[PDB]
Design a protein around this ligand. Structure first.
Ligand SMILES: Nc1ncnc2c1ncn2[C@@H]1O[C@H](COP(=O)(O)OP(=O)(O)OC[C@H]2O[C@@H](O)[C@H](O)[C@@H]2O)[C@@H](O)[C@H]1O
Ligand SMILES: Nc1ncnc2c1ncn2[C@@H]1O[C@H](COP(=O)(O)OP(=O)(O)OC[C@H]2O[C@@H](O)[C@H](O)[C@@H]2O)[C@@H](O)[C@H]1O
Lengths: 1348, 75
């Protein structure tokens, strides 16, 4: 913060007079004032020394000096507000760059979007209620949408007070909304009431300013609502208007000298608006209009606004000073008599100079425009100024859309610049579509979709590469992509370099976002290894970690045309940025709808899980569920019609997504709702029960299972059977056995019989030796343990051996299986050792039930048991909970049962029997009444007490927390079993139908195969249904037609919802409140223009009535103004012709100086020529060469403009013409190549010696003999009352557009000598050119039938 | 576009004279040109004119002339 406090005194200066020049007119109570009297007996802040010269009427340039500023800091109004406001005291003359740098860096203000400058009457302002309402509403609306910059004067009176109240009440009514309408105030430092407390030698970040409306003399108070303040000082005290020029200069610099994004420059829109004012308002408007800032006036508002609007459409020459005074006195009736002739003529000419420029002025017209809005009117004022100035083609309809992107207003982007004849050429909107997509701004996307912006060819490789470099900085995906570029940095991993984000990085991060699937959407390998392109990697000859097939290595790759998924590419980019409204629009135009929606659901679910900790992981999960329902709807619509093709579509692979077939892609999102919908479980019941049927009963297939002859009878229903495809009973038996249902049945029978076999060898075969029926167990454990080894090699990653066993460790049932194996190992050691048979008789009995838990695991099959055993899966830890609970209840009174009664049955480990073991037996029936039963009354009492808490509180209360919790997640438990159903089908489908007694052979079948084979490429027995092009196109085209059919219902569902219909009525009534409130004489006009170029002076007011020499104007006192180059080289030195040195020939050729007028004889007064056209207001020679006409030649070249075929281009009426124009580096304008006619024939050379040629230019000069168009006096801003400009206009033409005269002009060209640029240009009545030169173009256009 | 892929479309048939076509040189094909591409350009419009990109069917009547206007009204 101290950087500002040190920087401001270094840079900014301030004014203060240093000499005492006592004023003759003593001020009111300020008689001790030296013409400024700021704070002293004199006008000085130091010793009023004579300074060796007591110059009377001290010049401000010589007396006033600049001291470094220290009056900066902050202000807080004492009790009026609580926020802090910034303020800086600035010098009268200060570069705008310093001020802008201050407000950007040291004030934390970003670049604006709109610059509206409001000005009006300060002290004497009267307003009607309709006038007050428009400020109350429309200014606030335009300020709070575009994020405009409200710049105005800082004072406590008038229209700025209305602005302050209208900006404070919106902030208060916004209820602490994000962002505030920033307002900056600019006022002169001299006219401040209590500035004495604001001055602080040090950095006054704390400060207090108290306002008082009582002691207001010539001074004024500041406003308490402006957020920033700028105080300009000029040394004076009561001066009014020392802020207008600084504000006007700074506004243009802010608007037109900052924003340059992808091009030369970008000019921010700028608005000046008035309501009602006086002498300062006219000066402000006149100064602002010369800077190119458009001004809009409101009619029926005040005095100045009304008088300006009254002469809106009047011709410039029709204004008369008597008429101006007549309209002035009637609207200024309060102070009409206070106007003098000088003031009347000054205001007349301010009006005249304002109304000369019709392009920069608009009127609100006292509307029937207000009902539309004032927001609109003030906004297409800018866009009208934009149509008024465009160059060389249809850049207007591009610049308007560039502006409309930043407006955040759709109806303005639609209402004018999409209602006219829009030249389609849809490639225009790609630079605008990109901006709309990036800003988001999701609404403009649809608007561009109605206008034919098709996304299929809009999304190029480079466009998406640029899009992925402009992710949301606060988004999680951008942070992830800001890390992969660092995990694989420039030196060690992407060895050449990798500071640029390129498509392989996003492919790699998407693969992490995806599962263990195939290669992601963008090319990894050496063909497109997009990691290492910043160093000069070799071209096509390299083909290793570089570019192989693409065209050129230009710090890019080339046109990788579309990568066969241009829509899904935008869909992923919109999903990762969490743009909910934008992503739905892109999803509509998708090709592979179901796969894209399922992938979006998975990526949203897994991105929500990583990190933001609130408020967006919930929103990401909600959007994931929304896309889940969106996919379910499309699948339901596709499944209703012709379910057979819907199922085939379900299991197909998708080349555009790294295949991830839809059923497989759904599982990793865990997809509770999608897998449980209808046709999904229908297909699951279709792959299970593989080839037989879906109608046969479960109890009827098991009989044909065991009775092998019974397969061949007419009892079971195959699919081969109805097609009578039974040509081999062994073949239909193979088709029977291959189905997963019978593989499961035979496995369950084998596992049910293995337990009986194990029970056989414990009741009778209790021997310490491996008997006849013992090695069967060893081979059985060998066979079943090898299933897990087969699954380890089933679908692993080819690099991770330990990372795949983690998911096996993640299944507690696999842990139960391996523990049952370990318990078998622990019991076998006791089985083989003969001295521990008794411990082996009690340690293997628990294994019989540890295997029963596993046998219960595989009964997640039945329709009424699966969702029923999933309930006891919720019970599992609470099984232990209630076991620990009920064992403690039992023991609590098992201890107390044997206490009172004297029991005497005791042994070794059998006293424990009669003490504890008989307590649980007395619960379920085994009550020794002849043993358990004086204390008989208490035995009744306590026995009733235990069963009162167990059979009543611990038996029936479980039912409540069973049944209620059953109802709680029953929907979840139903779909969880639906989701878990595929896992059983997955394991038993890719498996041979051989018995586990016969799987021993198949365990070696793939081992002997690897004796011959060497690579794992045997077969892929997964769903993974690959499809041909002829059927893929015949299926995706079918789905798209159904996807749009589904979009019909939901779009119709939204409108049919009763709540939405409340939206329709509410906004229709809002359309009723706004619908029922509807109850001459041509002169040298350019010569009289002020602001003489290259000479900072002014010229005297010369009216439209007093312009001619015949009319007498008694006030005419033009200064004898001469340029700095008036006393100079061979040009006439008569700039000071008061001496008798003025003796050159008038109306005659004075040697080489042809000082004779081509129009007629000009009069001579006091030895000096007078302007024959009239009076200009500036006496002297100016920047011209000599007095009278300065003869010069303006050559013009014209040629026809042809089409591609070579025929002439055609207009509506007239024809098409071209001209050749030049642009000098220090001119910033287009002008004709015309030079001064000081030389005889080299006058064209004087303008085109470095432009046309050196030697061939003389040949072109000989061929320059053409036709003359116009001759005589020219209107020019460089015209004084003595030195004007006279020209001759020659026109040469190129009729043919082939090799002829044009051939000579092309080869002879030697332009690049001292000029900036030169080119042929289309002729138009909007082309950029000098206003004087446009007259020559318009006058000479009739000679060849050009347009206009 | 606003019907959101509704069933049925408002069929429109256009009739213009074959003489006044800008880029008809690419439309002429000796064989059956079921595939074809026509690119419109509003720059090289002399006495000729471009076709519309919204009509569903087109009929081009020819009369031997080139810049004749009104050879389609009677047909
Ligand atoms: N900075 C000022 N603050 C307050 N009152 C002022 C100021 N400057 C002049 N006045 C007073 O304003 C009165 C004249 O009011 P109008 O004729 O309606 O307005 P005008 O004098 O033209 O001033 C318009 C004002 O608009 C501002 O944007 C601009 O800086 C200018 O001062 C006079 O009493 C005059 O002393
Ligand atoms: N009809 C006119 N319309 C607009 N500007 C005009 C016109 N006539 C003269 N000017 C301007 O008046 C100024 C003084 O005229 P010159 O500079 O003598 O004009 P010219 O000889 O045509 O151009 C000389 C060039 O030298 C450069 O260094 C300089 O920037 C200027 O463009 C220049 O800004 C010039 O563009």
């Amino acid at each position: 913060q101290e950087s500002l406090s040190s920087w401001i005194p270094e840079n900014i200066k301030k004014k203060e007079c240093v000499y005492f020049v006592e004023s003759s007119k003593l001020s009111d109570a300020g008689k001790v004032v030296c013409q400024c009297g700021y704070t002293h007996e004199q006008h000085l802040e130091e010793a009023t020394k004579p300074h060796t010269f007591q110059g009377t009427q001290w010049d401000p340039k010589k007396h006033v000096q600049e001291m470094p500023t220290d009056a900066f800091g902050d202000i807080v109004f004492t009790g009026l507000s609580q926020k802090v406001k910034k303020y800086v005291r600035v010098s009268q003359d200060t570069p705008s760059s310093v001020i802008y740098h201050l407000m950007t860096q040291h004030w934390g203000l970003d670049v604006p979007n709109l610059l509206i400058s409001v000005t009006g009457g300060a002290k004497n302002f009267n307003m009607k209620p309709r006038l007050k309402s428009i400020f109350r509403r429309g200014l606030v609306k335009v300020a709070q949408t575009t994020g405009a910059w409200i710049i105005t004067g800082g004072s406590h009176t008038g229209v700025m007070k209305q602005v302050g109240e209208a900006v404070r009440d919106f902030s208060l009514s916004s209820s602490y909304k994000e962002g505030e309408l920033i307002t900056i105030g600019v006022a002169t430092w001299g006219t401040v009431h209590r500035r004495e407390g604001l001055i602080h030698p040090t950095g006054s970040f704390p400060a207090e300013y108290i306002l008082d409306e009582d002691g207001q003399g010539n001074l004024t108070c500041l406003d308490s609502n402006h957020s920033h303040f700028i105080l300009v000082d000029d040394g004076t005290h009561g001066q009014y208007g020392v802020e207008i020029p600084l504000r006007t200069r700074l506004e243009k610099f802010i608007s037109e000298q900052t924003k340059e994004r992808g091009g030369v420059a970008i000019k921010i829109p700028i608005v000046c608006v008035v309501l009602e004012g006086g002498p300062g308002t006219l000066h402000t408007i006149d100064n602002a209009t010369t800077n190119g800032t458009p001004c809009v006036v409101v009619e029926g508002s005040g005095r100045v606004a009304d008088v300006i609007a009254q002469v809106a459409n009047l011709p410039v020459s029709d204004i008369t000073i008597s008429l101006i005074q007549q309209k002035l006195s009637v609207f200024f009736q309060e102070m009409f008599e206070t106007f003098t002739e000088s003031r009347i003529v000054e205001w007349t000419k301010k009006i005249q100079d304002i109304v000369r420029r019709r392009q920069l002025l608009t009127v609100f017209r006292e509307g029937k425009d207000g009902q539309q809005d004032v927001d609109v009117a003030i906004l297409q004022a800018l866009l009208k100024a934009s149509r008024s100035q465009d160059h060389f083609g249809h850049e207007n309809w591009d610049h308007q859309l560039k502006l409309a992107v930043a407006w955040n207003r759709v109806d303005i982007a639609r209402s004018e610049i999409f209602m006219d004849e829009w030249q389609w050429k849809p490639s225009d909107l790609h630079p605008t579509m990109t901006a709309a997509l990036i800003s988001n701004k999701p609404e403009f996307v649809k608007l561009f979709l109605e206008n034919g912006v098709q996304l299929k060819e809009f999304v190029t490789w480079d466009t998406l590469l640029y899009l992925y470099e402009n992710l949301d900085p606060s988004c999680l995906f951008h942070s992830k992509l800001q890390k992969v570029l660092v995990e694989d940095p420039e030196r060690p991993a992407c060895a050449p370099a990798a500071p640029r984000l390129q498509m392989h990085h996003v492919a790699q991060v998407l693969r992490e976002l995806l599962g263990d699937f195939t290669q992601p959407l963008y090319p990894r390998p050496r063909h497109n290894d997009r990691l290492r392109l910043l160093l000069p990697v070799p071209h096509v000859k390299l083909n290793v970690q570089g570019v192989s097939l693409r065209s050129l290595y230009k710090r890019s790759s080339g046109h990788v045309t579309f990568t066969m998924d241009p829509i899904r590419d935008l869909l992923i980019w919109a999903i990762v940025q969490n743009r909910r409204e934008l992503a739905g629009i892109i999803w509509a135009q998708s090709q592979d709808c179901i796969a894209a929606a399922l992938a979006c659901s998975k990526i949203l679910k897994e991105l929500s899980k990583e990190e933001e900790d609130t408020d967006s992981s919930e929103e990401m999960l909600a959007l994931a569920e929304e896309y889940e329902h969106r996919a379910i709807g499309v699948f339901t619509e596709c499944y209703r019609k012709d379910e057979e093709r819907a199922q085939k579509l379900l299991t197909r692979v998708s080349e555009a997504w790294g295949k991830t077939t839809c059923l497989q892609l759904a599982l990793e999102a865990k997809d509770m709702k999608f897998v449980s919908h209808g046709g999904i479980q229908a297909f699951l019941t279709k792959v299970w029960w593989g080839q037989l049927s879906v109608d046969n009963g479960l109890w009827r297939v098991t009989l044909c299972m065991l009775a092998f002859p019974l397969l061949l009878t007419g009892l079971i229903s195959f699919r081969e059977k109805r097609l009578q495809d039974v040509g081999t009973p062994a073949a239909r038996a193979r088709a029977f056995f291959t189905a997963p249902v019978v593989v499961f049945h035979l496995n369950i029978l084998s596992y049910f019989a293995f337990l009986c076999l194990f029970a056989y060898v414990l009741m009778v075969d209790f021997q310490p030796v491996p008997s006849w029926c013992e090695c069967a167990i060893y081979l059985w454990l060998f066979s079943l343990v090898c299933e897990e080894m087969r699954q380890l090699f089933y679908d692993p990653d080819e690099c991770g051996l330990m990372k795949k066993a983690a998911l096996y460790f993640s299944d507690f049932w696999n842990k139960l299986d391996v523990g049952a194996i370990l318990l078998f190992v622990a019991g076998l050691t006791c089985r083989l050792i003969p001295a521990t048979l008794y411990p082996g008789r009690v340690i293997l009995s628990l294994d019989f039930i540890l295997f029963c838990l596993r046998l219960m695991h595989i009964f997640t099959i039945s329709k009424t048991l699966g969702p029923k055993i999933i309930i006891v899966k919720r019970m599992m830890k609470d099984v232990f909970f209630f076991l620990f609970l009920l064992a403690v209840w039992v023991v609590s009174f098992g201890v107390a049962k044997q206490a009172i009664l004297i029991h005497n049955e005791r042994r070794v480990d059998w006293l424990f029997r009669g003490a504890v073991y008989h307590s649980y037996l007395t619960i379920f029936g085994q009550i020794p009444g002849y043993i358990d039963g004086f204390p008989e009354w208490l035995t009744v009492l306590l026995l009733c007490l235990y069963l009162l808490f167990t059979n009543i509180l611990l038996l029936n209360l479980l039912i409540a927390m069973f049944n209620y919790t059953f109802q709680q997640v029953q929907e979840h438990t139903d779909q969880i079993w639906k989701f878990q159903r595929h896992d059983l089908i997955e394991e038993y489908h890719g498996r041979p139908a051989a018995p586990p007694p016969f799987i021993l052979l198949s365990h070696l079948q793939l081992f002997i195969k690897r004796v011959v084979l060497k690579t794992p490429a045997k077969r892929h027995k997964q769903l993974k249904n690959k499809l041909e092009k002829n059927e893929e196109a015949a299926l995706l085209s079918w789905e798209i037609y159904l996807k749009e059919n589904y979009l019909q219902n939901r779009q119709f569902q939204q409108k049919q919802r009763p709540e939405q219909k409340i939206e329709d009525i509410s906004n229709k009534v809002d359309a009723m409140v706004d619908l029922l409130d509807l109850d001459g004489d041509s002169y040298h006009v350019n010569a009289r223009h002020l602001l003489y170029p290259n000479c900072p002076v002014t010229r005297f007011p010369v009216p439209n009535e007093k312009v001619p020499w015949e009319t007498e104007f008694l006030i005419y006192d033009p200064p004898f103004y001469t340029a700095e180059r008036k006393d100079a080289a061979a040009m006439d030195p008569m700039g000071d012709t008061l001496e008798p040195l003025s003796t050159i020939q008038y109306n005659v050729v004075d040697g080489l100086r042809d000082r004779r007028s081509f129009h007629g004889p000009y009069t001579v007064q006091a030895g000096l020529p007078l302007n024959p056209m009239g009076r200009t207001g500036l006496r002297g020679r100016g920047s011209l060469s000599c007095f009278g006409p300065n003869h010069t030649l303006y050559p013009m070249v014209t040629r026809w403009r042809r089409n591609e075929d070579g025929a002439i281009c055609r207009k509506s009426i007239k024809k098409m013409l071209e001209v050749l124009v030049v642009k000098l580096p220090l001119s910033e304008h287009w002008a004709l190549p015309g030079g001064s006619r000081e030389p005889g024939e080299m006058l064209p050379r004087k303008l085109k010696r470095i432009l046309r040629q050196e030697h061939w230019p003389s040949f072109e000069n000989l061929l320059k003999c053409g036709m003359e168009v116009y001759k005589g006096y020219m209107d020019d801003p460089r015209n004084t009352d003595n030195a004007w400009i006279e020209t001759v206009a020659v026109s040469v033409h190129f009729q043919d557009q082939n090799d002829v005269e044009l051939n000579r002009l092309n080869s002879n060209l030697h332009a690049c000598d001292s000029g900036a640029s030169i080119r042929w240009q289309v002729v138009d009545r909007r082309i950029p050119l000098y206003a004087n030169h446009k007259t020559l173009l318009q006058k000479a256009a009739a000679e060849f039938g050009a347009h206009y």
